[PDB]
Each structure stands twice: as structure tokens, then as C-alpha cells.
Amino acid sequence: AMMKAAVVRAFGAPLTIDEVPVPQPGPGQVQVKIEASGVCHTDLHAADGDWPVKPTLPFIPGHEGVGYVSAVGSGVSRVKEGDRVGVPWLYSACGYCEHCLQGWETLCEKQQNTGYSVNGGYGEYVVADPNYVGLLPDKVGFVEIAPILCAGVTVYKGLKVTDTRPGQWVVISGIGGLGHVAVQYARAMGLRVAAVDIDDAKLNLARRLGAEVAVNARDTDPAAWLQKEIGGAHGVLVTAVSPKAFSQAIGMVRRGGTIALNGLPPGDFGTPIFDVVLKGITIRGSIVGTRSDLQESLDFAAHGDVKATVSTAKLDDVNDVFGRLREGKVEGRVVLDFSR
Amino acid sequence: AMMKAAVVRAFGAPLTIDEVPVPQPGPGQVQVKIEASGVCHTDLHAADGDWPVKPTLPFIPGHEGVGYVSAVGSGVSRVKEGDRVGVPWLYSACGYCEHCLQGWETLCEKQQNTGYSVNGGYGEYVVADPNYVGLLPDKVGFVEIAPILCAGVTVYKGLKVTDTRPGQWVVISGIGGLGHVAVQYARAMGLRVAAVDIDDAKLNLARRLGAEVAVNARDTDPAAWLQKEIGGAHGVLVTAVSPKAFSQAIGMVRRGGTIALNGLPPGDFGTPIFDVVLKGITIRGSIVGTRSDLQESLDFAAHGDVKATVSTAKLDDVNDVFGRLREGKVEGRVVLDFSR
Amino acid sequence: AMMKAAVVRAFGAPLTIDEVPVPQPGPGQVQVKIEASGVCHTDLHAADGDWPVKPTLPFIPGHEGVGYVSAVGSGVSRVKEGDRVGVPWLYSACGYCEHCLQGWETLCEKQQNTGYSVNGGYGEYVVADPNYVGLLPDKVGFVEIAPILCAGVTVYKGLKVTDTRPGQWVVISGIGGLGHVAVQYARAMGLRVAAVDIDDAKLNLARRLGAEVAVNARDTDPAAWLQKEIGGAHGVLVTAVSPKAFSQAIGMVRRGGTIALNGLPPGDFGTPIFDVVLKGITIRGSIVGTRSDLQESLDFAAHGDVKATVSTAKLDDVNDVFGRLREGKVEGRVVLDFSR
Amino acid sequence: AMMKAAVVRAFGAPLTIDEVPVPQPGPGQVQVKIEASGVCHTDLHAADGDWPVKPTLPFIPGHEGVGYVSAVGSGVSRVKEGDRVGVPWLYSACGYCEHCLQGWETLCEKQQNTGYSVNGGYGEYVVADPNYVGLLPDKVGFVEIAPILCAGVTVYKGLKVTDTRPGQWVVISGIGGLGHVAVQYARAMGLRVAAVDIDDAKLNLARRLGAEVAVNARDTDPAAWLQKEIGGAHGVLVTAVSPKAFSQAIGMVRRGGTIALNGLPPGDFGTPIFDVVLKGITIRGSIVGTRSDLQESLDFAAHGDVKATVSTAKLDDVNDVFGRLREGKVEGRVVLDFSR
């Protein structure tokens, strides 16, 4: 069989919409017929070769692909044909290293990454490791659930690792694909939410989604503003694609506060070490979520506590989508629609 | 009525040994007759006024004073005349704020600091808040115990907040004034210790103190070496906080690990976003400790698990001591001896 | 010089409504003029002389007293005359034992208890330690806020120590004074709630306050019912005044689950140790809350996440109130109102 | 094709040593050639069919078998021929449930148990699931390491779940088969150890293994004595879970402390509500451990920190061993030796 897929063939170059072979599931693998496929900013970082470790070219991006199991290889019991599943960033892990045994498979040094080290969901079919797919809730449609496979699970786990508790303040910095669902997870977890971004439209979205307080970092120093407005936050989750946002986040917390980092812009951010030590501050990287995190994050969507703000596009318009996302012209998430 | 004390009357200027009034305790205060008084680099910063918030002038430095309660004010129950006590960096906290109520008085924004914001132990007597003094173990001498009020509690608490557990690996980065004490606490906490420094003498010492591995960073890349040999460390305690040490800690730690920063350096440090995020690293600031941390740290000294390298000097030679300290000639810790 | 108070002159015998002297505040004390005063099931036992350790006669009960600071002794800085305050079970603690230093003043062996070991708020005025009073929110009336001083802080802390997290299931066992507010704190903390009691009126209260599911332990086995209904709970909070139910709670949890205990009926409860070990279950007692817990629990009431269901009564009718409470004829809480 | 094994063919009967077919590994399975096989009281419960859910007959007991991988089925990568491995109580878990995904496979309701629900190591060969075997340290002989698969991991994990930390006090209650191993882990974990038993010889042993204090409960009330001496223990590990040991643990633990129950006794135990609640005590069941706990526990044996007292026996004499065990004549652990 042949399928349409969007392929990266050179860093910085436009993706090509090609006819390519349909991947077939070997022993212990499954095939997924894609119905929707979220576009994550990581897909841009990948196509641009922003990161120190680059993807092997050529490859099909996409780690928010969701659909139906369409074929099953031998030795598969976790899922069966017809099951609704998603294939997230964590494509597989080895299952028995120290991290894996501890339930931290997101740290597995042997992991594969969907739409980066193996082909992903910007295509009609993808082959997956059924041990690591998301099992989707019946009550949510493919387009709406697609962003939970990366944006949702990532911010959910990120918020968990801020070590905040109900009634405390959390700042979400960057109200984009990740950030706009972070506001909702944070509210679902009993947190009071402050929003920071550099575009009023994104702050307006945060407001509609439950923020409480919001500030535009292009209009004022957001750290100073938050110290005055809420007395500093207990936690911050940084989903921004700007190193400057990372530095500013450090100044947003109360003493003892924790800044969790999801954003992956290239380079360093300036860190005020003296203050971090004097004020007992924690800065913590957070990387997607484990299968447990993923299933939990999906249940929030199923219960209606989180709903992604989504616009759809066709596979053939991926390059325009990438452009708009680069320019910061996307509200929430774009999700590629493969439905009939 | 009068006592000898070393006084800072001008930032940067030699200290003067002066005759000054003996401070007398009011309601809820106690008076301590100093028998030994530790010296460290913090005293240089106090005396130079080069930190963001300066001491008020004039003042008597010293946050490592140990002695006997020589007088009490009214309404004092925690200690009584003749008790052996130390007057550490945390002189007092407000008792009522969010932090104090949670047992995190080190984060109190209203705290007073001994030998910095109030007079300290470079004098024959000092007035203290009995609610915050350290209660010293009976069987350890004054000169030996003094640095535990500073180096001891700092590295003990720093080790606690690496979130490591018995059997796991910790790197002690820097085997100097703090580092040589940290190796001992780490071993007493059941940790496997890897010592990292550029001085073979210090590394040979770390081995004497129980380090399982010692790497000289002049000769070998400790990040590459530790990743290969032990798979990276679960925790890193950075006791000499330089940009180089900070970067190398990011390299040495295993994914999911925690780096505790135990020192107060000048300037912003460049923090690599990709590494911290993808490796799920925690970076945490930690200096000194709460009253409970301090009492816990004193117990290890009492049981013979931890002994600071100590040398003595007289009060009248404090400037010679400051000079030796500034020139990096001090091995271990110098302690002023007020003994008959 | 004189005031009305309900006094326990002799155990087991109805309380006498007397005119007794007004207590005056000495140094470090404050006087509080009572506006409302909650009735806890605990007060029944104080009055009976029931528990292992008894009050000393004669005494005035009441540790849900709220009002205004009417007089201040010397050396008091936390509060001033006219401040809105409440005087909870934890009247005072020593401030410096291991528990106190660790922010667990509720475990202080030197604690005094309001309306038990020292006089409480079943009277027009009460003298208190300002270091331990609750600081009340302006926007909640006295009658409504009174139960937060014990019912509220207790179940708030109890829920914290079930170690459950948002999205997980908690069972509230016993929907009385404590229980009806526990349902509300649990929802504010992001938990899914199930209710257990022996009366459908009490279950309906719970359903109206946010419980998703409910069951009558007289109609059917609640443990078996819950295992079927929700697949077992991640946590249970037992506020019941029955040793049974304490036994039944253990059967409601998933493997690895935690049962927190607030209720204080006399005697033992039967514990299936084999299952507790096999299933990795935790059983944990929880005693009121620290000052930090109290302030947090008051904040939820301030923000309107929690609102006690309350009936008022006059001091003079205390004994009638005791009867109804004893017979399970109270909905939520009864609060003595001193309103003119 | 054939091998000797000890088989239970009727509950309570002597075991019969039979010639039986050598089990051959299918896909995903490995075969282990047994070199040593630990015996413990759990094997008596398996052979007697004592517990709520019985073994199916007939079966080969033994959940402490260690040896070499002798054959590897298809699709096995974790181990290879010649690897030294143990086959512990947790034979396999489902891999997919809430507990398995969270790294708590010991809570898997679908787990299989070696030498209980599937054949175990009282035979020359056994077939195992490679994903769940213990990977044995190179330094330690088969006979010495065998009990670590059971006593070792159980007491190690039990100590971890007391939530104690270096410098704190733990009581090891019972210094027998489990308890003498627990004293050694506790010391290696930096805990101060108080031993409690009624046997002076076992108490002497505890002292020689590093216990700081030892109390004979025949002669002195260890609850009263420990409260007086050490102010109560932060944790209590109860290795012989009798009603008396359990109630005394409640008396020995300091307020806020944690009691870990390490054994599977018959019947309900009476738990004092008042003491557990007022003292804020945690009681927690814990037996064996996850794959991560097992590997961590094996590391302590590898480093020489823990050594079980072991004597050997031949497979043919397993009934004489069961006899000694039932009569209470076994000191330490007995391990069947299959070596040539």
C-alpha cells in the first residue's frame, strides 16, 4: 500500500507531501490509521534542526497522532484492531533500566521518539509500540484529544513536578499549545493561575480558560508585576519558546518556590544563582510524561476538565501551519485532520 | 561592662580590635560568653559589604560563635545559664509568616543574620535569641564544633535536598572548606561518594574521608568519566559554585538527578535549556538550614561521624586570618580561640 | 468583671450556665470577646470525663470559639485589639521541641488544648495565646467560620495526609460536622468524592456538597459496594464515631491506598493485618492541624470553596444541643451564637 | 529431560522428592539452572495451603532460587545464557495496570508468585520470566545471596517505607530470620538501631551487628523504656507480626512516627484508635519489593554491608529442614545447596 505523508528532507527546507510506502507492523508492533495529528512546536525545532541531537533525515514528524489500530503483529495483547490509540513522543523505552523500573520511562536512555528518531504521525498510517501508546477515552473525538498526547501530558506532568498544592499560585509562562491546556490542568488541580505571554490575544485566551491574573511581558517586567500582584507564585511552568522567559520566570516565585521547565528553545538562559541559593529556589526540567501520566492526563480530558482549543488543517497545508506557528499566529493548537 | 571585639567600621578596611560594652540581654534574650568563634568566607563578604544588601556599620562579624549561656533575660525556657550553645547565621525569624509556620524559617524575609545584620561572635560576649541558638553536644569541644554551625549544617541540608537515598551516588564537587565536611556527611548518610576537584591533595583527602571514587578535573572530564563509570550521579553537591563547576555538574548528574548549589557566587550563570529539560534535571539552591537541620547536623559531629579540619587563631590576629583566607591559603577552617 | 459561661463542674452531669469572672490577659496573652462558638463532638467527651486523659474540673469547653481581640497583654505583636481571631484545639505548643521545630506543633508533648486542659470558648470571653490563634478572614461571618477552627482544619489536614492527588478517588466516611466539610475540601483539592454514613439524609447532604457517589452502611456493605462502584478508593478519610466503619474503611481502598483517621470513638478496631501487608495499605491517624494547616483551611472558606452547614443555638441551650448531637440528629454543625 | 524436585502433592503432607520433566522455556521465557535455593516460613504456608488463596496442586515450592540462565526462549534481551539470576516471589506482573505503570508491580492484582502459583526453585531447573528475575551481583556466592531475594528485599523496602532518614531512630522488632538482616540494612542506611526481642541471644546478635540499644521485653516494657531513653523511635519495623509486637510498636513509636509491618499473620488485630489518632501514627503494610527495590537490596549485599546468617541442606533433606523450621529450631536462614 502507499500513503500520503509530510516528509522533512533538509533542515530549514519546506516539508514535501509525498506518496510513501505504508509501514507494516512487525512482531510486537501495531499499525495505526491516523484520524488527527497535532502540530507541536517541537516539530518545528525538529524540521529546523534547532537541537544538539538532530533527527535522522528524512523522517515524517508528528507525535500527537491519534486514530484506530488497523493491524496487529504477533505477540500483542495490550490492544487490538479497532482500538482508539495515540502515539506520543515517548515511542518506546527499554523497560528494565533503573529509570524504567522506577516508573520514570521518560528518562530511559534507550528510548525512541515518535516523529524524531522513528517516523511519526504526519501521515495516513504509523507503526507503533503498543506497550507505549496512549489508550484514548471513548467520550472524546480524535481532533480534540490529539493535543493531550503531547501538550496535555507534558504540562500535566510539569505541573505535578512544581510541587505546588491546592490553593497555591502557579504561573503559566507561554500560553500556546502547551500553555493553554496548562491553565486548565492547573485549575483542575486546585491551583490559582497567573498567565504570562508577549501577545494580548494569548493572554485573553488564558483569561477565558481560567487564569485569574495575566500580564504581557512586552508591556512590563512580569516578575516585578507578579511579586506586587500576588506576592510571588509558589510555582511556575515555563512553556515559552524564548530563553528570556526562562530568566524572567526565576524572579516570579516566592522564596522556596519551584520553576518547572518544558520549553525547548535552543541555547542558555541567564540564571541569578545568588538569589536561587539565598531564596532556596528550585529549577526543574520536565520531559513529557510516563504512560501513567499520559493516562491520567487523558482522564482529565474525558471528564471535561480540560478541552484543547483547536483549529484543523489539511496535511497539504503543513508548511503554512509551520509558518503561522513560527510567527506566533496560532491560537492554541493546530491539528491535522485525516477524517473523511 | 566592657569587652574586646573585632569591629568592622568601614567596608574593606582592616578590622579593629576595640574595647566595647558587653551586650546585656533583655526579655526573651540570652547572653553567650564566647569560647570559640569560627571564621569563613562569608565574614569577608560581611566585612567588604559586597553583597546586594549590606551590613549596617559599625558591626561585629561572626556567625559561628560557640560558648556558654552567661546570662538570661526574663521568659526564657529553652536554655539556661551554663548551657553550651552556638549562635549561627539565622539569628532570628519572625515566627508568623508562611515560611516560619511551615518550618522553613531559613526562608523568612524578616530574618536577622548573626555577624551581618546584628552583632555576632567576634567578641567575648554576644546577645542571642534563645529560640534560634544551636544546642551543642556535650562531648565535642568548642573549637571542633564551631564550623558545624556553618559548613556542617549547610552541606548536610544541601545533601538532604539532593533527594538521594542510601546506596545512591552523590558527587561532592569541591573538597575545600565545605566539601571536606560534605564527604563525611554523605558517607554517614549511606551515600556512595564521588569526589571531584582539581587538587590531588584534596582528592587524596576525600578518599581518606570515604570517597569511593575521586576524579581530577584538570586531567579527566569528570562528566564523561562518571557517565561511563557509574552511569552519572544521582545527586551533585556543588560546594564551590563557579560557572565551570555548575556546567560540569549538569554533565555529571544522571537523568532525573538533582544538583544542590551550596554557595553564593556573583553574576548570572548560563543554564543550558536542552540538557536540563531532556534530562529532567533538578537544580536547587541551598545554604545553611533550619533549627531542626542544625540540630540534626550537630548529632553527626557528636557521634564522631563528622569532624571538621580545624586550626586556631587569636582574636587579635583576625586580619592575618582574613588575609590568609583571601589568598586561598586556608586548609579546612580557622577558628578563633577565646579559651583562657 | 463577670460573664456567662457553660461550665463542666462535674463529669457526666449537665453543664451549668454560670456567671464567672472574666479572664484577664497577662504578658504574651490576649483576651478574645466571643461572637460565636462551634460545638464539636469532642466537647461531649470533655464533658463526660470520657477519654484516657481527662480535663481537670471545673472547666469551660469549646475550641471553636471565634471573636474579636478585646485586650492585649505585653510583648504581643502577631495580633492587635480589634483583630478577628479564633481559638482552636491547639491552644499552645512549646515552640522548640523536635515536633515544633519541624512544623508539626500538633504533636507537641507540651501542648495545651482549648476547652479541655485550659478554659475555652463556651463563654463570653476567653484568654488565648496569640501565637496559636487562627487569624480569620473578614468576609466570612462568625457563625459560618467557627467550624473551620476544628471541623475544617481537621479534615483539610486529614485529606492532605491520605496522600491522594487530583483526579483520584477519596471516600469520606461519616458526613457529620467534620464529614460534610471534608466533601467540600476534597472537591477543592481536585479529588473525586464518595460518601459513607448510616443515614440517607446525611448522604444527600454529601451529594449536594459534591460527592459523586454515596452508600448507606446500614443498607449494604460499603466496602464491597465501593470496590464494585469505583474500583476501590485511592484514599479514605474516616470521621465516623463508630469503631466499625473504621474496620470497614480498610476494605474500601485499592492496593497501595491510604486510610486517614480523624474519629475518636473509644476502644479498638479490628484490623485485617494480612490484607494490609499483602496489599501495601497505609493506615494513618491525623490530629487537627498546624497553624499553617489552619490558615490554609480558612483561606478555602474565604474564597467560598467551603461553607459549613450550620444551625445556631444559644449558650443556655448547650445541653439540648449535646443530646441531639449524641443521637445523630444534627445536620452538619451547631454553633452557639453570642449575637445580641 | 528429567530432574529431581521437591513436590507438594497434598497440603500438610511431607514433600516428595520426585523425578520430573525439566521445564523448557517458550517465547519470552528463560530457564534457570538452580545452584542454591532459600527456604523460609512462606514455604511452610505454601505447603500447608494455609493462606486465603491456595496454591494449585501439585506444585514445586521455592521463591529464593538462584543459579545460571541455562536456556533462553525467543525475544529475550534482558538476560543471556550464563547470567547469574534469582527467581523471587514476584514471578511476573501484568505490566499494564495502574500499579505496574506506576512502578509498583508488587501491587499487581494479576501477579504470579514463584513456588506458590507457579513452580519454583525446589528443583534442579525452573522456568522464569526474564523481565522479573533478580540480576545477581558478581561478588557474592549463590548460597549467601539467596535469602536476599526474600528476607533482604522485604526488610530493605520495609525500612524505606518507615519514611525515616539517616540519624533517626528505628526499632527492629524481632531479631530472627528477617530481623537480623534488617539490623544490617538499617545501619547501612544511617539509622540508629534499637533492637527489641525476648531472646537474650538474639539481642546479643543485634548488638554485634550494630544495634546501639537492645531491650528485652520479658524484663522491661520497651514502650516505656524507649520513650524515656530515646524519646520514642521515628520508625518501627515489625518483623514478627504478633498482636503483642504490634501493640508494643504503637507504644514505642514517637508521635508522627511510622510502623512498618513486615509479615503475614492470621486474624484481626485490635488497633487502639485514640493512640493512633492522637499520636498521628502511621501503620503501613510492606512485604517483598519491586524489581527496583530488589536490585537496590542486592547492592547492599554486594558491598559487604549485609550478610545473612546461612546454613545449607540438601534437597533430599527438605523435610528435615521443614521440621526444624516448624519447631522453631532454625537460626538465620537455611538454603538448599545444589552445587556439585
Ligand SMILES: NC(=O)c1ccc[n+]([C@@H]2O[C@H](COP(=O)([O-])OP(=O)(O)OC[C@H]3O[C@@H](n4cnc5c(N)ncnc54)[C@H](O)[C@@H]3O)[C@@H](O)[C@H]2O)c1
Ligand atoms: N519538555 C517537553 O516534554 C515538551 C514537550 C512538548 C513541547 N516542548 C516544547 O515546549 C515549547 C512550547 O511548545 P508549543 O507547542 O506550546 O509552542 P507554541 O508555539 O504553541 O507556544 C509558544 C508560546 O510561547 C510564547 N512566547 C514566546 N516568547 C515568550 C516570552 N518572552 N514570554 C512568554 N511567552 C512567550 C508564545 O507567544 C507562544 O504563546 C516548545 O519549545 C516545544 O518544543 C517540550
Ligand SMILES: NC(=O)c1ccc[n+]([C@@H]2O[C@H](COP(=O)([O-])OP(=O)(O)OC[C@H]3O[C@H](n4cnc5c(N)ncnc54)[C@@H](O)[C@H]3O)[C@@H](O)[C@H]2O)c1
Ligand atoms: N483527629 C482530630 O483532630 C479530631 C478533630 C475534631 C473531631 N474529632 C473527632 O471526630 C469525630 C467526629 O466529630 P464530629 O463533630 O464531626 O461529630 P458528628 O456527630 O457531627 O459526626 C458523626 C458522623 O459519624 C456518624 N456515624 C456513626 N456511625 C457511623 C458509621 N458506622 N459509618 C459512618 N458514619 C457514622 C455519622 O452519622 C456522621 O454524622 C469525633 O469522634 C470527634 O471527637 C477528631
Ligand SMILES: [Zn+2]
Ligand atoms: Zn510535543
Ligand SMILES: [Zn+2]
Ligand atoms: Zn529504560
Ligand SMILES: [Zn+2]
Ligand atoms: Zn561561616
Ligand SMILES: [Zn+2]
Ligand atoms: Zn517569618
Ligand SMILES: [Zn+2]
Ligand atoms: Zn474538635
Ligand SMILES: [Zn+2]
Ligand atoms: Zn513542642
Ligand SMILES: [Zn+2]
Ligand atoms: Zn522466602
Ligand SMILES: [Zn+2]
Ligand atoms: Zn499489573
